[PDB]
Amino acid sequence: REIVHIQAGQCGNQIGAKFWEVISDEHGIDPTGSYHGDSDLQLERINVYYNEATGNKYVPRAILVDLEPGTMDSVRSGPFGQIFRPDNFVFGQSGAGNNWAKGHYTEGAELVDSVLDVVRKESESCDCLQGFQLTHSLGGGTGSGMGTLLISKIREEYPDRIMNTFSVMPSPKVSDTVVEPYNATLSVHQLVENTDETYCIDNEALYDICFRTLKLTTPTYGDLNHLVSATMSGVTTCLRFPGQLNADLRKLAVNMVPFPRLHFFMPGFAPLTSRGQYRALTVPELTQQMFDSKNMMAACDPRHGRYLTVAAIFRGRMSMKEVDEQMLNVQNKNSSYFVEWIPNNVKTAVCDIPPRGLKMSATFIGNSTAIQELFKRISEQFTAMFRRKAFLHWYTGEGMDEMEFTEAESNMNDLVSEYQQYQDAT
């Protein structure tokens, strides 16, 4: 049943907030916390993400974490800001300075037990907790360094629960500081070890989509988060509405993850829409677009690797016979990019209720070995600075040693070799 949600840092809290906006509208919950919808299908799985509270209002099972109060005060001021449980706002005062070491070892360590007390209070009210989801970026300090510290501590206290992350990957096209490859590389090893699923949301891809495809000349973070909230809605449609499958987080992970470390997914969405069209997509169009590189939120070419597993979730009123034929069409048409040793590795679900503003949509979840391109990219940016020990003083000043960077870089290259082993297999 219950999922506990955590959002850490600026990026984590900004996309986390938009996620709760979007799905709160899908379940008919208003900023009050009052259900004001029309179909009881909106309420049948409301408990996955919401607690029922005083006055029979619905309160997100959400914990909001930052090392500075800025972004969280602006969440409390945001549209749905009053919907969150005030006790679940856990913030420090000093910030993390885009510094993984401050988030993971010094400032964050000061705050982390406080966050786990809230997690514990939310789990204890859970009839049968499926697991956790985290929104965060890997490029800064709090979401990256404290987020992964949190994930380690959660794994210590709940080692038999699923941990899934929506992890924003840094890119020089959308870049706050030069030390993002450092923070991302340190974080990716934490994720390899302590996560069951990670959605690699590449800020490169989000930018390119807004620019090349939504024709947005100068995309903002709001442009980028619109894509992310639409994709998170689609990825979790499975769990929030009654459909064909009844799969919890564990069962979804079981059928997507053939090898424990290869759990980094490329998400995609169709149709791609900017903040502000009336011609619905045909089922052949949904299907073609969701497999198109340009609809992928992880800036990797799927034709440069092989799909280990794919899931897809179609939303709206449509012909599942036509879905079946189109899904089977795009596989049997391109069976060269699916591994041959996982039979029937493309799975599809339909949900009748479409997202706000579309009559038809499709969410793509690919476990492709092409994701190695993302990790190679971060690794090249990492070593370009690291071979001159550039900007390291920010980290050694918090107690870290160069050796910990050498290990993180080397773990990342191992992960890349693993993906390459299966891209050439049978």
């Binding site: 079946d324 089977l328 596989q331 049997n332 069976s335 041959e340 039979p343 049978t426």
Partner: protein
């Protein structure tokens, strides 16, 4: 755009069929064990028929009929003929044959001696390259120690000039609808050595296999290129020499035999209402005797074509067997009707 797999690399025929399919631009070749194929050109041995037709959304076709080996191996062909009422024990066009293991051995020798005390020829052949002919029963029964023993045809039709022996190979395609298609161009595999009724263990005169003649025989390629005479020359000979045609004297019998062999096993092998579908190309071998009577020798399940006819036959396998199932963007076959 259709997909296919190639699981028999050493088939002359489907090697060419694979290359014709690609050149249409609407066929893509996958690797051996990819199961998302439309068409399988399968191995000759242990082909996995049980795995076909279980891929959702894929029409699947294979170039072999499961069960057709009963027609296409020596011992099972004899058992199929003698025990199937459609091809009686009284079957006018199959040589009297016997299944002997290293069973009908005692049944056979009753046939020997009624002919032997009946003042008739008693030359027999043993078959299963390990092939021996003689009028001694002791001879081959000795030598066998499964094999088949059948009456040698002591008066074959002999072409002149040469006084030479021959056999006819006919190519037959059975499509997924069990239409029986006889390829219009047959071939006649001749011996270049003349024929001699006394020295049976001079077998390069008595066995017309293309292999024997090429480097075990003295006068190969003498009379015709390849020891291969096509149908137009053989027809002219029968007109010039015997005052008849290939159609009347021989082909009528050949068509009757092909249709009766294939119509007999149809209920056992047909894929009409199966979840996958088969076609298959057969090679039928006939002996013609001096009375212009045709005899079936053996059926080949994986045959090679004659070099001049590959282009035309393989193009006809694509048209009638493959694109009949998977359509794209006068005929060289005679349809044998049932």
């Amino acid at each position: 755009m259709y997909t296919f797999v190639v699981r028999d690399e050493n088939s002359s025929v489907y090697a060419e069929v694979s290359r014709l399919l690609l050149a249409t631009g609407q066929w893509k070749r996958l690797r051996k064990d990819n199961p998302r194929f439309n068409l399988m050109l399968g191995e000759r041995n242990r082909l996995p028929f049980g795995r076909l037709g279980h891929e959702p959304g894929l029409v699947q076709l294979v170039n072999y009929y499961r069960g057709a080996d009963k027609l296409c191996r020596k011992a099972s062909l004899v058992k199929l003929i003698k025990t199937s009422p459609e091809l009686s024990e009284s079957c006018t066009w199959f040589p009297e044959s016997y299944v002997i293991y290293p069973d009908e051995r005692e049944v056979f020798l009753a046939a020997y001696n009624r002919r032997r005390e009946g003042r008739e020829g008693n030359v027999w052949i043993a078959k299963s390259e390990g092939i021996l002919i003689s009028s001694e029963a002791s001879e081959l029964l000795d030598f066998i120690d499964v094999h088949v023993i059948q009456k040698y045809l002591e008066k074959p039709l002999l072409l002149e000039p040469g006084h030479r022996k021959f056999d006819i190979r006919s190519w037959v395609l059975v499509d997924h609808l069990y239409n029986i298609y006889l390829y219009r161009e047959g071939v006649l595999r001749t011996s270049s050595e003349p024929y001699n009724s006394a020295n049976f263990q001079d077998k390069t005169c008595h066995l017309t296999n293309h292999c024997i003649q090429k480097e075990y025989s003295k006068n190969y390629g003498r009379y015709e290129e390849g020891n291969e005479m096509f149908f137009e020359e053989f027809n002219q000979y029968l007109m010039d020499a015997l005052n008849t045609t290939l159609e009347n004297s021989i082909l009528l019998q050949i068509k009757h035999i092909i249709r009766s062999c294939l119509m007999c096993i149809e209920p056992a092998i047909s894929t009409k209402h199966l979840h996958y579908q088969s076609f298959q190309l057969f090679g039928f071998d006939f002996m013609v005797d001096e009375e212009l009577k045709v005899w079936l020798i053996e059926v080949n399940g994986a045959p090679a074509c004659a070099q001049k006819l590959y282009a035309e036959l393989c193009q006809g396998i694509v048209d009638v067997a493959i694109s009949s199932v998977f359509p794209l963007a006068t005929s060289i076959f005679i349809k044998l009707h049932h």
